[PDB]
């Protein structure tokens, strides 16, 4: 439960560092600094406008942006699901 | 199960009171009164257009709005998940 | 499991009948006929653009539209969750 | 768990082949090639803008497009839920 939250924080920070470098110059409102990137990757994790709002516009400059975002989604969404179930199971 | 629904209603009302005060003047369509706020925070909880539709436009006036909305999402979505599982288990 | 799918079909049809009558005249693209309504209520159940795309525009003509849509969401989303878990539990 | 991931990959590929043929000519940005189709069907599976962004605009050319997309959603979202629970249980 604690290790799951620790793995998610580390992965979320590493990805936000990676995103700032990759799309920061071309998409500064979404990835211009670490803070902007952490906020965008939280939104992407909630699946809110991830494709129409973020990744499709990013792919028009970086055609392989999906190699970062789709595995990011698949990982964080599974980890969050594993985390929330983990708290509920430990409570019972 | 009942206490979970009670905790969620209290938290949802407190947050709706907080939102009306914070962004009611600058965003009156989404937070102009308690009723408008309760409706918006229900939408934010369902994750529908929370960032592109609500929080990014709010952050252009209030840059720290994320300190209210991200913890609100993390709390209510976990509580709802705990509530729905609670009914199914019982 | 079967009764859950039966309850969901009945509720989904009743709601689609209710919506066609309520918002069909003022929002004919989303609720103009039973077929259009069933499609919109399926979208509303998946939570896709339910508020920005459907219910906020509907509330500008019908201010109490939320009395129909919010309880519809709370019911169908809980029933679907109960249905999907029901199949998985019965399979094991 | 492995067979669930195998069933999902096969179904996802078959559907992406089907979509390219069906709406590739009329919607080339979303279904112009197998790669574009696989990306769109992943988005549709996450429920992101599936109706307002994809299926409503597709239905204005192909009125029965819902016969492909609604069953696609019902299948893949159930399979993914079955997959994620499968890993956690194991
Ligand atoms: C796990 C999820 C963590 C979410 C953290 C988001 C932090 C984002 C943030 O702090 N800002 C960017 C919001 O786009 C605002 C600052 O840039 C602003 O306060 C300076 O001004
Ligand atoms: C725990 C979930 C709680 C959800 C509660 C939703 C409350 C809906 C708020 C509401 O009543 N209105 C605002 C809709 O934005 C409409 C009124 O303001 C209008 O009918 C009279 O004026
Ligand atoms: C449970 C979910 C059931 C979903 C059923 C959707 C049916 C919608 C539908 O059939 N149409 C409206 C789509 O907006 C298309 C017809 O109106 C068209 O084929 C006639 O032309
Ligand atoms: C089971 C989940 C499977 C998800 C698979 C996503 C596939 C992404 C498709 C893709 O590669 N592109 C289309 C993006 O729309 C980009 C290329 O077309 C481009 O790099 C070369 O041209
Ligand atoms: Na959305
Ligand atoms: Na969504
Ligand atoms: Na969702
Ligand atoms: Na959206």
Author numbering:
A (entry chain A), C (entry chain A): 131 to 222
B (entry chain B), D (entry chain B): 131 to 220
Please quote the authors directly.
Prokaryotic sodium channels are homotetramers, in which each monomer contains six transmembrane segments and is homologous to a single eukaryotic pseudorepeat. As with the eukaryotic channels, their S1–S4 segments form the voltage sensors, and the S5–S6 segments from each polypeptide chain associate to form an eight‐helix bundle that constitutes the pore. The selectivity filter (SF), which determines the channel's Na+ permeability over other cations, is formed by the close association of the P loops from each of the polypeptide chains.
The locations of three highly occupied sodium ion sites are seen in the centres of the selectivity filters, with ion B‐factors similar to those of the protein atoms. The crystallographic identification of these sites as arising from sodium ions is discussed in detail in the Appendix (including Appendix Figs S2, S3, S4, S5 and S6).
